[PDB]
Design a protein around this ligand. Structure first.
Ligand code: CLA
Ligand code: CLA
Ligand code: CLA
Ligand code: CLA
Ligand code: CLA
Ligand code: CLA
Ligand code: CLA
Ligand SMILES: CCCCCCCCCCCCCCCCCC(=O)OC[C@H](CO[C@@H]1O[C@H](CO)[C@H](O)[C@H](O)[C@H]1O)OC(=O)CCCCCCCCCCCCCCCCC
Ligand SMILES: CCCCCCCCCCCCCCCC(=O)OC[C@H](COP(=O)(O)OC[C@@H](O)CO)OC(=O)CCCCCCCCCCCCCCC
Ligand SMILES: CC1=C(/C=C/C(C)=C/C=C/C(C)=C/C=C/C=C(C)/C=C/C=C(C)/C=C/C2=C(C)CCCC2(C)C)C(C)(C)CCC1
Ligand SMILES: CC1=C(/C=C/C(C)=C/C=C/C(C)=C/C=C/C=C(C)/C=C/C=C(C)/C=C/C2=C(C)CCCC2(C)C)C(C)(C)CCC1
Lengths: 164, 131, 80, 743, 146, 132
């Protein structure tokens, strides 16, 4: 049972967190899908966060720094050819990922195949994995917050720590 | 064990400028010029090792090894003549109540193992076989 | 491969057989010298041509001479 | 008791001249006596290899400490001589009054054999050789003013030299420290990082704030050197200082209180270069050293000694281990506390690396008054420190290899970083080989492509700023960042750290001191060539360190040693397979690398920076901007650089620059001479010697020390030595002669 | 945790199992490449490889060649690519002759004379055709603008 | 019975699998760290030990190191691809440096090096002076 075996993701501040019990009757396969989705959504969020921060900061040294510092405006300014490459490239990696998933012994979320060398018995391994998840969870919320600020509040920079 | 397996190679000594096949042969009987890697589910170097899902690193899969038991045999076979010479001399020096060369060998090697037997002087052997 | 020859000027110092990096030389019984031993080259198929043996000989002119010749994988020291 | 204590043995070695009369005493083998000429050479080659002279680390350590005192004594005598020669054989006084016109000179030749021609009419009613070490500028910055002061610093130097020499004798013959004393890294670092560097900086800041700054302000204003008050006067009369810097009036009260702002008069962050002298503002330099001093002193309190608080380096090193690196940095502490060679490796590499950095930072940000306009001194210093650096870096690699062959112990290094490195050496070397080939083919190919195209009448197909262009975009970007920094990322600064990044043209005396240096296609091409040269050097040197103990070819290389000629003619040939030989080959590549770098500096500067500017804005560079379209082809370097800029040396005869011409020729000769040692072998020479000896014997006489030919290894060494001397010597003269004229 | 282990658990083979050498990503990519994929016939293996290599080769010649600025530059680029393909094909032919010999038996083993010949043929067709496809594509480049 | 080693990129290659291979064996009384010719450090086992190498010299080099540990029971073998094994060293059970009765002389010339024939004399013969 996923609930009886899962070790990564359960941390100190709240322990197992399922207030709405969205995983009570789910089978191992569904739960595996959830974990994979969680990690992917989180990892993409972390990356997006870094991208937004750099652009907002003004460090966008491409196209002669022609594009706007506002991340959301810049996307509109980007030629479609750029976007197409992005989607297609990510799609390619997705295909390869599917191949890895099919291979026996797949651990949800592992694309490097670290299972070959390390298992969850190692506490260091589980801990580092937890850090990825925790930071990813935070990043997900952050990217959603930042977009709100840029689209509604009207700012695309830090309004929290900016005041030294 | 074919003690001549190595000697039976394709090497042909030249007239002048070559030491020869020496004692254990100059070259491997097999030819190193084999092919490269092959697609999954295929073999290339004759009795090669299947690379499984990683044919690219098939050459790193060992198939040639040494059996410890077999190792003992090769030691005995290649050193048979030496043992013969040793026991023969022991026999020549009027062994005490001698029996048969082979019998003596077994008795002398029962004790002092075999390696020790090969490295012992006839005098030491006679002292050992005084009994 | 290479050719190693021993001459009558040998004194059975055993230094050559103790220097070979590939066990090509041996000490065999002999009566021409006080030591009662002479060197032999039973396994020249493993000579790499180092000439360390020659460097160890104490005789006026080397009693052990290595003449380089045909080259094989063993003589060319190829691990690949 | 205490972890850190002083242990010294009294009267360890008797002082006598007996051993002096017994050459070769240090070695067991050499001590027996000379039988062939090889003994003589070996005596000199094994003189300072203490590890082979004794088997006790304590003894080796003791010798090193004392030997170092000896070097310090020599250095002090050297500095002393320079100051003396600047007091009795120089035109400093005249130069001080008119720095722009009079030329620096501190060496005079005796009037023997027409050599007097070498005494040039430098200026100030003085005739001598124009020196290029930059002593005058340094002395002015210190505030010397007089030549009496130079004499006294010379006397101090002599005294210091003697003290050091005594110290060497004392700490080897009368009070020799024991090994336990030497093995106290934490204490040594605490003392050296807080006392040697921290207190040193603070002391210097004191001199700069109380003596140099005030005097230099007066000098720049126009006050005659004779009218400037003596140094002691400034130290005593605070009122005088208050006039110049109106904050000394407040005294040290602001300092003890937190109001450090009041001292903004002399401690500043102006940036840029002083318009009058063309050098960094001394006020900034004073704040620099003061700030550095605080940092160093604080850092000196990081390691444990005898009071509990602090860090133990062993613990820090062992804790830093990861998933991909096994046991991590375990075992390194013992190595660096039980092997002098290992320590020298790291220290020597870093020292050389620093010299190279000094060269770059000292031209972009001229540190001394009236140095930038003196093109000769600028070029001399850059090249000098570039070279010192290269040699030291290669030396570090050499001693690193000596460690692997002599001190490495498999037992103490299991699954540590070192072990794991030696376990994938094939991968490292293989990849580096490829990187070198990639860079070399692409980088040099650009030049060959361009040459072919220009020769075939197809200039539109060249990799040039006027055709296919390869712009250094990344570097151009960083330059802009640094240019706009003042007032933004560096709010309290007032100007760019260097005008090279951008800004205006600073001119002193009608000559350009600094100007924005731009980067284009040619710069891209040359920079990548520098990468290729450095990378290849690393390949040879690293291969030597990694494959020092063993290889697939010679599995027992370790037993053979660090410096063996070969293993034999077998295995297809094993010539030059020792680690020493790798260093031998590495030096040749280091020569190439540095040569290209110094040439880049010389042509770029004389073409895009140095020159004269009119009262109005008209900049005339020395060579005329030829670097952009001429340095993109090899023919360009041969014609627009070597052939054209060598017109000075070749036409120096009959002038005070005649010496450079003679040396230019002499160096070429020595370079060629070396090629006979590098291409030939001992066999031919030994046989020739036999015939020569026959002649001497035929006349009933011959040396008992039988004449023998130089060893294989020595042959290579002699060749490399002459090769390096000749090559560097040639450029030395070329540069100096050209520079004298351009200045 | 150790991410580097002896390959195939043989401590004495000259290879190591690093993340780069043996990761799910590397294994997956290499397994499905035309060269090592399972089921592909010698001809098809060559075809896929050729189709891939021909498409990217027309670029360098077309945009940086002697007649790049000429109106017939793309045509010239195509011809140049075909020439390079011919040189490479000669190499493949010669390699096969030396490595495999003159008469074969196993069959369906990329490492035999017959299979190699089929592989070579596929490469030529695929490469030349792929280059042609690029010519057609580069003739008119889409701006993907609405 | 393999000694404890973590692997290296300096091990054997294809030749070991298609042409020829070597193997050394020895017995130890304690677990100690030794340096392997391939590069790196390994820990021998308390008892029998077996290691594979690509060259005879590499094997004999290790034997030298073993002698330092006071181990003199080493044996070297050559394993061909088909599985055939040849015992190579100590060949007759007695180390070569020690005269063992029963060994015959080979490649011996009964005269000083200076008594070899002149090259011209053996011209168009195919033999060399040192083999003449
Ligand atoms: C001008 C003289 C010269 C030249 C060209 C070289 C060239 C080289 N040396 Mg070398 N060397 C020299 C003098 C020279 N050496 C001397 C005097 C010494 C004595 C100290 C050494 C000692 C030495 C050592 C010890 C090492 C080298 C290494 C190298 C190689 C660096 C890798 C590289 O860039 O490949 C590129 C080579 C080129 C020549 C670039 C130009 C070639 C064109 C422009 C590129 C495209 C050509 C293309 C491949 C084929 C065209 C086809 C058609 C022409 C037929 C390279 C082969 C290192 C090495 O092998 O590591 C890789 C190394 O370790 N050298
Ligand atoms: C992609 C979204 C996503 C997904 C699929 C999961 C999935 C999972 N989380 Mg999780 N988590 C997320 C985001 C996500 N998380 C975020 C952003 C946080 C930070 C608050 C957390 C914090 C968190 C903790 C602290 C723990 C988990 C745990 C778990 C696992 C068991 C709980 C469970 O079944 O949840 C089922 C969840 C889903 C099926 C999907 C989530 C439901 C969606 C998102 C509805 C949207 C609701 C939300 C309000 C949308 C608005 C967001 C924003 C606009 C305000 C499960 C694999 C537990 C665990 O690891 O145990 C093994 C655990 O202890 N999560
Ligand atoms: C296969 C190699 C390859 C090549 C030749 C290119 C070439 C190019 N990419 Mg590209 N790209 C690649 C792989 C590659 N990419 C991959 C693997 C990804 C990630 C999936 C991207 C993601 C990417 C983005 C996101 C963008 C480009 C853009 C561009 C173009 C630069 C701007 C321009 O049109 O100037 C002539 C250029 C045509 C930019 C572009 O077309 O915008 C104008 C752009 O925005 N690329
Ligand atoms: C992890 C915490 C965190 C994160 C994610 C950000 C993220 C951001 N900060 Mg911020 N900041 C932080 C901590 C953080 N800050 C702290 C602790 C301070 C106090 C030193 C500041 C002070 C600060 C200033 C003064 C500015 C930013 C700005 C920015 C934005 C530009 C990105 C950049 O290059 O910054 C740089 C970006 C959204 C810039 C911004 O809002 O641009 C519009 C900006 O001007 N930050
Ligand atoms: C780095 C140190 C250094 C160097 C390179 C020079 C170099 C020079 N100095 Mg100088 N000098 C120095 C330090 C130095 N000095 C110091 C520290 C002082 C203060 C004492 C002086 C004081 C000084 C004066 C006062 C004069 C020079 C002069 C000169 C020039 C002529 C040198 C000379 O006498 O030639 C000729 C050399 C000799 C006469 C010495 C004889 C050669 C001896 C006998 C050989 C050595 C014997 C050997 C070591 C035996 C070994 C025994 C064993 C116990 C070791 C020359 C350019 C002269 C000059 O420029 O005049 C215009 C001059 O007048 N110097
Ligand atoms: C006049 C005083 C004096 C006397 C009589 C001795 C006597 C002795 N010392 Mg000693 N020593 C002295 C001063 C003295 N020392 C000083 C001042 C130092 C500190 C630098 C040392 C450092 C020292 C060390 C480190 C060692 C000795 C050793 C020895 C013994 C062997 C002599 C030897 O190696 O010949 C040396 C004779 C020479 C002529 C060498 C001189 C080389 C010069 C200084 C090079 C520089 C010249 C020039 C500037 C550079 C080129 C231009 C001997 C008992 C050695 C010994 O046996 O220890 C057990 C030893 O290892 N001494
Ligand atoms: C901090 C500097 C430093 C120190 C303390 C040492 C110390 C040592 N090195 Mg080392 N080394 C260094 C820098 C240093 N090195 C650098 C920078 C390099 C790179 C070039 C080397 C390269 C190197 C090699 C390759 C070797 C050493 C060796 C040694 C050891 C014995 C030295 C010896 O034989 O003495 C005797 C010293 C000499 C014979 C030098 C005399 C000077 C010669 C003749 C050149 C003079 C050139 C001169 C300036 C030109 C004048 C021109 C004029 C005539 C016109 C010793 C531990 C050797 C060893 O066995 O280590 C264990 C060894 O093989 N080192
Ligand atoms: C194609 C069929 C019709 C072609 C036609 O009608 O010509 C008519 C056109 C003539 O197009 C010409 O183009 C030139 C350059 O721009 C000129 O400027 C003119 O545009 C024009 O006259 O031919 C083509 O250019 C298109 C043909 C492209 C062929 C596709 C590649 C197929 C593979 C080629 C490699 C063969 C080698 C082995 C194959 C396996
Ligand atoms: C470079 C990226 C980097 O720093 O990775 C560092 C990587 C991981 O290091 P670890 O954190 O596992 O080990 C920590 C200790 O080495 C102390 O830092 O080490 C390697 O394996 C380098 C591989 C060769 C380098 C490839 C070129
Ligand atoms: C040039 C030269 C030289 C040099 C000289 C000099 C360098 C002089 C000077 C000297 C000096 C002039 C020194 C000084 C010093 C000082 C100092 C070093 C200071 C210190 C300080 C302190 C110690 C403080 C302390 C404290 C504090 C911290 C605060 C509180 C109080 C107290 C007191 C506690 C010589 C001749 C050698 C040689 C040649 C060259
Ligand atoms: C960086 C990277 C990557 C990669 C990339 C690449 C490398 C790409 C390539 C690509 C390519 C390189 C592609 C190719 C393509 C090709 C094609 C598309 C072709 C086609 C052809 C056709 C279609 C046909 C032809 C023909 C024939 C066959 C013959 C007859 C005629 C014709 C014409 C019909 C990715 C993103 C993954 C990810 C990340 C990393």
């Amino acid at each position: 049972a996923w609930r009886d075996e899962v070790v990564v993701g359960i941390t100190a501040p709240v322990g197992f967190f399922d207030p709405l019990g969205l995983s009570k009757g789910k089978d191992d396969a569904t739960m595996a899908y959830y974990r994979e989705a969680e990690l992917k959504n989180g990892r993409v969020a972390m990356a997006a966060c870094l991208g937004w921060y750099l652009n907002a900061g003004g460090v966008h040294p491409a196209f002669n720094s022609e594009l706007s510092n506002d991340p959301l405006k810049a996307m509109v300014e980007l030629p479609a050819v750029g976007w197409l490459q992005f989607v297609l490239g990510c799609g390619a990696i997705e295909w390869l990922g599917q191949q890895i998933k099919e291979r026996p012994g797949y651990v949800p979320g592992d694309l490097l195949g670290a299972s070959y060398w390390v298992d969850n018995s190692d506490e260091g391994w589980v801990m580092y994995q937890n850090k990825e998840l925790n930071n990813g969870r935070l990043a997900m919320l952050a990217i959603v917050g930042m977009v709100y600020q840029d689209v509604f509040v009207g700012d695309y920079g830090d309004m929290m720590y900016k005041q030294l | 064990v074919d003690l001549d397996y190595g000697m039976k190679n394709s090497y042909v000594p030249a007239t002048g400028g070559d030491g020869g096949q020496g004692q254990f042969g100059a070259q491997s009987p097999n030819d190193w010029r084999v092919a490269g890697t092959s697609p999954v589910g295929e073999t290339s170097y004759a009795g090669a090792a299947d690379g499984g899902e990683e044919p690219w690193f098939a050459e790193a899969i060992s198939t040639v090894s040494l059996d410890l038991q077999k190792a003992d045999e090769t030691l005995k076979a290649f050193t048979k003549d030496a043992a013969a010479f040793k026991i023969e001399e022991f026999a020549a020096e009027k062994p005490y109540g001698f029996t048969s060369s082979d019998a003596a060998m077994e008795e002398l090697v029962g004790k002092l193992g075999y390696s020790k037997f090969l490295e012992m002087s006839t005098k030491q052997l006679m002292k050992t076989w005084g009994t | 491969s290479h050719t190693v020859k021993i001459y009558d000027t040998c004194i059975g110092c055993t230094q050559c057989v103790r220097a070979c990096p590939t066990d090509v030389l041996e000490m065999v019984p002999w009566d021409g010298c006080k030591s009662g031993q002479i060197a032999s080259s039973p396994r020249v198929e493993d000579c790499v041509g180092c000439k360390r043996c020659e460097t160890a000989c104490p005789t006026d002119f080397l009693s052990v001479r290595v003449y380089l010749g045909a080259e094989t994988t063993r003589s060319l020291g190829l691990a690949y | 008791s205490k972890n850190v204590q002083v242990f010294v043995e009294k009267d360890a070695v008797e002082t006598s001249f007996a051993k002096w009369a017994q050459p070769g005493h240090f070695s067991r083998t050499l001590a027996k006596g000379p039988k062939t000429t090889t003994w003589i050479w070996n005596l000199h080659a094994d003189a300072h290899d203490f590890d082979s002279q004794t088997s006790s680390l304590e003894e080796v350590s003791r010798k090193i400490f004392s030997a170092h005192f000896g070097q310090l004594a020599i250095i002090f005598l050297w500095i002393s001589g320079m100051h003396f020669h600047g007091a009795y054989f120089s035109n400093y006084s005249a130069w001080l009054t008119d720095p722009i016109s009079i030329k620096q000179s501190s060496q005079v030749v005796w009037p023997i054999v027409g050599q007097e021609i070498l005494n040039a009419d430098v200026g100030g009613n003085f005739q001598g050789i124009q020196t290029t070490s930059g002593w005058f500028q340094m002395w002015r910055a210190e505030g010397i003013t007089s030549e009496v002061e130079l004499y006294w610093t010379a006397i101090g130097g002599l005294a210091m030299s003697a003290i050091m020499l005594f110290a060497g004798w004392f700490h080897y013959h009368k009070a020799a420290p024991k090994l336990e004393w030497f093995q106290n890294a934490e204490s040594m670092m605490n003392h050296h990082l807080a006392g040697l560097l921290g207190l040193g900086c603070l002391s210097w800041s004191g001199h700069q704030i109380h003596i140099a700054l005030p005097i230099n302000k007066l000098l720049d204003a126009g006050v005659s050197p004779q009218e400037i008050p003596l140094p002691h006067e400034f130290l005593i009369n605070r009122d005088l200082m208050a006039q110049l810097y109106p904050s000394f009036s407040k005294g040290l009260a602001p300092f003890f209180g937190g109001n450090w702002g009041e001292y903004s008069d002399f401690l500043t962050f102006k940036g840029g270069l002083n318009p009058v002298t063309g050098g960094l503002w001394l006020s900034d330099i004073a704040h620099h050293h003061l700030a550095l001093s605080v940092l160093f002193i604080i850092a000196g309190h990081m390691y444990r000694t005898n009071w509990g608080i602090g860090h133990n380096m062993k613990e820090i090193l062992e804790a830093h281990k990861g998933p991909f690196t096994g046991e991590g940095h375990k075992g390194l502490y013992e190595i660096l506390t039980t092997s002098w060679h290992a320590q020298l490796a790291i220290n020597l590499a870093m020292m050389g690396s620093l010299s190279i950095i000094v060269a770059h930072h000292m031209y972009a940000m001229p540190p001394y008054p009236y140095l930038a306009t003196d093109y000769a001194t600028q070029l001399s210093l850059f090249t000098h420190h570039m070279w010192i650096g290269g040699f030291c870096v290669v030396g570090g690699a050499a001693h690193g290899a000596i460690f692997m062959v002599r001190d490495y112990t498999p037992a103490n290094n299991y699954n540590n970083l070192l072990d794991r490195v030696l376990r994938h050496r094939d991968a490292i070397i293989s990849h580096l080989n490829w990187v070198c080939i990639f860079l070399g083919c692409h980088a040099f190919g650009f030049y060959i492509h361009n040459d072919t195209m220009r020769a075939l009448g197809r200039p539109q197909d060249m990799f040039s700023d006027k055709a296919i262009q390869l712009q250094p975009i990344f570097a151009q970007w960083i330059q802009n960042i640094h240019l706009l920094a003042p007032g933004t990322t560096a709010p309290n600064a007032l100007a760019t750290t260097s005008y090279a990044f951008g800004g205006d043209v600073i001119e002193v005396g009608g000559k350009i001191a600094m100007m924005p240096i731009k980067l284009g296609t040619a710069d891209f091409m040359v920079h990548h060539i520098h990468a290729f040269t450095i990378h290849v050097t690393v390949l040879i040197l690293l291969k030597g360190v990694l494959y020092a103990r063993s290889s697939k070819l010679i599995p027992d290389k370790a037993n053979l040693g660090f410096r063996f000629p070969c293993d034999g003619p077998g295995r297809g040939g094993t010539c030059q397979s020792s680690s020493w030989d790798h260093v031998f080959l590495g030096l040749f590549w280091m020569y190439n690398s540095i040569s290209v770098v110094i040439f880049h500096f010389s042509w770029k500067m004389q073409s895009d920076v140095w020159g004269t500017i009119t009262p109005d804005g008209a900049i005339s560079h020395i060579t005329g901007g030829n670097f952009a379209q001429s340095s993109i082809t090899i023919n360009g370097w041969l014609r627009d650089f070597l052939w054209s800029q060598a017109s000075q040396v070749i036409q120096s005869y009959g002038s005070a620059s005649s010496a450079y011409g003679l040396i230019f020729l002499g160096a070429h000769f020595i370079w060629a001479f070396s090629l006979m040692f590098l291409f030939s072998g001992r066999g031919y020479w030994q046989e020739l010697i036999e015939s020569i000896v026959w002649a001497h014997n035929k006349l009933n006489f011959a040396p008992t020390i039988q004449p023998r030919a130089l060893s294989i290894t020595q042959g290579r060494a002699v060749g490399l030595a002459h090769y390096l001397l000749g090559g560097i010597g040639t450029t030395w003269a070329f540069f100096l002669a050209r520079a004298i004229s351009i200045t | 945790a150790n991410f580097i282990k002896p390959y195939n658990d043989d401590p004495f083979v000259g290879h190591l199992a690093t993340p780069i050498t043996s990761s799910s990503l590397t294994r997956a990519l290499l397994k499905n490449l035309p060269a090592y994929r399972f089921g592909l016939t010698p001809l098809l293996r060559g075809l896929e490889i050729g189709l891939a290599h021909g498409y990217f080769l027309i670029g360098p010649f077309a945009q940086l060649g002697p007649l790049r600025n000429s109106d017939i530059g793309l045509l010239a680029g195509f011809l140049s690519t075909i020439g390079l393909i011919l040189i490479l094909t000669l190499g493949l032919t010669i390699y096969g002759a030396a490595a495999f010999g003159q008469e074969k038996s196993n069959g369906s083993e990329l490492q035999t004379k017959k299979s190699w010949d089929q592989f070579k043929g596929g490469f030529f067709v695929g490469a030349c055709g792929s280059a042609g496809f690029a010519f057609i594509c580069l003739s008119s480049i889409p701006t993907f603008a609405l | 019975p393999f000694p404890t080693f973590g692997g290296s990129t300096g091990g054997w290659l294809r030749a070991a699998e298609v042409e020829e291979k070597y193997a050394i064996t020895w017995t130890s009384t304690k677990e100690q760290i030794f340096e392997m010719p391939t590069g790196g450090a390994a820990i021998m086992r308390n008892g029998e030990n077996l290691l594979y190498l690509a060259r005879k010299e590499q094997c004999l080099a290790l034997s030298t190191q073993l002698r330092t540990f006071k181990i003199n029971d080493y044996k070297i073998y050559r394993i061909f691809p088909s599985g055939e094994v040849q015992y190579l060293h100590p060949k007759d059970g007695v180390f070569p440096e020690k005269v063992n009765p029963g060994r015959t002389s080979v490649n011996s010339r009964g005269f000083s090096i200076g008594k070899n024939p002149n090259p011209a004399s053996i011209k168009f013969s195919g033999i060399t002076t040192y083999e003449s």
